Amino acid sequence: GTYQDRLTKLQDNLRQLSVLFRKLRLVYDKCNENDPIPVEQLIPYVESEERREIAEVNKKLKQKNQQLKQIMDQLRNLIWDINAMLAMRN
Amino acid sequence: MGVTCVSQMPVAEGKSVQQTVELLTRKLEMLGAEKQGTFCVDCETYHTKLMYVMHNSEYPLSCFALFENGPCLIADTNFDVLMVKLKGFFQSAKASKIETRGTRYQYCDFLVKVGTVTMGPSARGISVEVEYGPCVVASDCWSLLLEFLQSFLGSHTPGAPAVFGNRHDAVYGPADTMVQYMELFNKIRKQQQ
């Protein structure tokens, strides 16, 4: 009776495979709907207010990283306290 | 404990007993082996049945008591206290000081006990003994000891020890090496000279 579970599993797998096939066809048409400009413009030759939002939130997320950094440093002190507890518990 | 090879090599037409010993030590210094101290194995016989009541400086607590060929008692100090009390069942049988005296050397957990053989005060032989520490099981590492023997002895390279004929797959015992030492003593006591 073990054979039935594997075949039902593979039937669900191929159903999801067909769904994924059709959705990649959909997004392939969606990405291919817009291209006029060709390649070889892409090689890098040597010869507005959203940027304010980016600049202001970069240091806010860095400050959040530091604020959690002091907290996890305090937790590091706590875990260095707690690992010596079991070290000489007996 | 570890697998041991024990043999004799003579003066071998070069100067004296200790000249070849010094040649081996300077060869080992060319290899560059450090020392761990000295060693000496002393023997003494008793009889009514030949009692080999015998000692080694490597394990001074180990007082070996053997028959001529029977079981061996690696016994403690109080056995030596009990041994004195008989004196009529087992006579002293003095003048049996056949000893091997020398030094021990180490090279990357390899140990060498090399020295000369004496009948008390007078030296009439050279004892050669090679061994390795982690040799737990016997008769499985003889290629290593054979390579070590041919590495620096050159001439007089021995092989096939007597206790290797006592084939077993258990841990090598100090009684095996000890046996080898008394067989060595039997080899040297015949020639005297």
Binding site: - | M1, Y107, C108, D109, F110, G133, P134, C135, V136, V137, D140, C141, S143, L144, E147, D169, A170, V171
Partner: protein
């Protein structure tokens, strides 16, 4: 038996090759001549090919008897329904494929609890063979299992697991107290041997080598299979330098996917 049934194949091919080769001997000598410009490029090639085909017949005759020496020695309707089950075994090998373990994985980034009795069932699967080694499972500290392994008369190994995954593994010899004075298994110590401490580093590199993100059972099975090669220690010389001792060290390092004893210098 199939050793004779496959050793007969060389002889049954060799006799037909004898027939074909003697047919070649007949017709090539019967072909007359093909000069191809110069005569010295033909008449000296005449004896060359006449030796060639006759000696081919001779060597075919000769290799016939060394194969002949080694060899030794409802009625048909229901026979047809027997071997189809046996060819269904080949049909099982039809859909196998040689792709096997190797895949084309990219980065795994987008855009749990299991009982210790499952760990016991895991350890019972592979301990059933290799009788020279033993497994002693114990959990004196928490639900994590650390195991004592004896290897014949050679090695005593403590193997600590945690969270069903690998924690640690320390190997010592055969004549040491692996327990403590209290009797518990030792946790933090050293093997007190140069070779053992040297190969513990190789063990640590090996445990970080077998990397399965989901399937640690094959990781520890490959680990103990790798360890099984270490019962041949102090008994096999090195494969490139000939001698055992490289600066006094016998070969120990078994290479990944190719298990043979080497050194760090011996790679």
């Amino acid at each position: 038996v199939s050793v004779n049934l496959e050793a007969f194949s060389q002889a049954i091919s060799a006799i037909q090759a004898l027939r074909s080769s003697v047919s070649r001997v007949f017709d090539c000598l019967k072909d007359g001549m093909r000069n191809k410009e110069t005569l010295e490029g033909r008449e000296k090639a005449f004896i060359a090919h006449f030796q060639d085909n006759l000696h081919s017949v001779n060597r075919d005759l000769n290799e016939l008897e060394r194969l002949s020496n080694l060899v030794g020695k409802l009625y048909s309707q229901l026979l047809q329904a027997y071997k189809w089950s046996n060819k269904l075994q080949y049909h099982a090998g039809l859909a196998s494929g040689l792709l096997n373990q190797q895949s084309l994985k990219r980065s795994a980034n987008q855009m749990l609890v299991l009982p210790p009795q499952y760990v016991d069932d895991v350890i019972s699967r592979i301990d059933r063979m290799f009788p020279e080694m033993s497994i002693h499972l114990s959990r004196p500290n928490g639900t994590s299992a650390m195991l004592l392994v004896t290897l014949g008369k050679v090695l005593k190994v403590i193997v600590v697991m945690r969270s069903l995954f690998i924690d640690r593994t320390i190997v010592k010899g055969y004549n040491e107290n692996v327990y403590t004075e209290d009797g518990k298994l030792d946790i933090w110590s050293k093997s007190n041997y140069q070779v053992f401490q040297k190969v513990t580093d190789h063990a640590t590199t090996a445990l970080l080598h077998y990397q399965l993100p989901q399937m640690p059972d094959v990781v520890v099975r490959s680990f103990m299979t790798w360890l099984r090669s270490y019962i041949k220690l102090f008994q096999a010389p090195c494969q490139r330098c000939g001698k055992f001792l490289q600066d006094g060290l016998p070969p120990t390092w078994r290479d990944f996917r190719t298990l043979e004893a080497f050194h760090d210098t011996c790679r």
